[PDB]
From a paper:
Sulfatinib is a multi-target drug that selectively targets FGFR, collection stimulating factor 1 receptor (CSF-1R), and vascular endothelial growth factor receptor (VEGFR). To achieve this, we determined the crystal structures of sulfatinib in complex with FGFR1 and CSF-1R using X-ray crystallography. Notably, the flexibility provided by the oxy linker of sulfatinib emerges as a critical factor for the FGFR and CSF-1R targeting, allowing sulfatinib to adapt and adopt multiple binding conformations in response to different kinase bindings.
The N-(2-dimethylamino-ethyl)-ethanesulfonamide group is exposed to the solvent-exposed region and makes a hydrogen-bond interaction with Asn568. C The R-spine of FGFR1 is linear and consists of Leu547, Met535, Phe642, His621 and Asp682. Consistent with the previous reports, sulfatinib demonstrated potent inhibition of FGFR1 and CSF-1R, with IC50 values of 34 and 5 nM, respectively. In order to explain this on-target resistance mechanism, we constructed the binding models of FGFR1V561I/M/F in complex with sulfatinib based on our solved FGFR1/sulfatinib complex. Introducing bulky isoleucine, methionine, and phenylalanine residues at the gatekeeper position of FGFR leads to severe steric clash with the indole group of sulfatinib.
Numbering used by the authors: 460 to 765
Write the structure that this text describes.
Amino acid sequence: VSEYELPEDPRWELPRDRLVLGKPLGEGCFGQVVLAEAIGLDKDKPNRVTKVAVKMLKSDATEKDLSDLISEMEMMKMIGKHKNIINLLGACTQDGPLYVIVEYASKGNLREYLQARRPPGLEYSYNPSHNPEEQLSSKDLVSCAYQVARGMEYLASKKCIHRDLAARNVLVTEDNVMKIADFGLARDIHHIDYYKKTTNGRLPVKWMAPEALFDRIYTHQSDVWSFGVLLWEIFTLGGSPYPGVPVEELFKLLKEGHRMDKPSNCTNELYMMMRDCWHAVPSQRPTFKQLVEDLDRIVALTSNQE
Ligand SMILES: Cc1cc2cc(Oc3ccnc(Nc4cccc(CS(=O)(=O)NCCN(C)C)c4)n3)ccc2[nH]1
């Protein structure tokens, strides 16, 4: 029995013997995510199995870690469901460690998904996958961007600021639906280390708007700046931002007006949309509502023949 009072919500609680735990999906310093099969997740369909992702704490986990995971779960309930975010499906709070059960995205994060779909040749770096998949169409790429914009428009409408929107935090389902992840994470109460890599080797400083970098100010406008970086990641098919640029240099550069150059395969229109997201002045960036409307139009005009 836990020493803590884990919050049981009858609408969401699943007996944990309805979960058949499967392979690890990922592990961080937080805990771990595993794939599972859930039996009768939908009450009206008790005999059906659903593949799901299950988040749980490491054994080394503290009380703040627990509080953080509960917090993510409750924030997700409050934000509600949208097609282009990772949605809550249930929880196990009784009879063992806390499990938070969410939609499963079988194709993993967007950066690695795009990298494995890199065609040969001059416009992209090499494909690092030993199981490369069919390359995407131009329309497919704009449609990835559109779906992420639509998810952020929803989150913004629910007053959620993501604060680390990046291709690594977009997951892709079996049906190639884009789903924003890690939007419900607690904001650390301590100052951050700008030079500390994630468990997957990423430096989050490269997605920060200048006002976030400089003064730790995060708003929907600073998420639009990150979406501009994410756009650049899409049209480089998973490229790494500011190539050759040491991180301790980045703010100076940005402040002087430095911006990433256009990816080799990227329309003038989509590069101008990136640059607009990277407006120095937060009030002058487009909103996610505007981004969605423009990307909708651009998707309809973009060829899926190549
Ligand atoms: C409460 C909560 C639960 C939760 C679960 C999350 O993870 C989820 C949720 C839904 N689906 C997937 N699918 C998935 C499939 C393959 C691999 C991965 C992990 S990965 O880091 O993107 N790539 C694996 C190895 N790379 C580093 C080489 C995830 N994960 C992510 C955030 C979450 N927040």
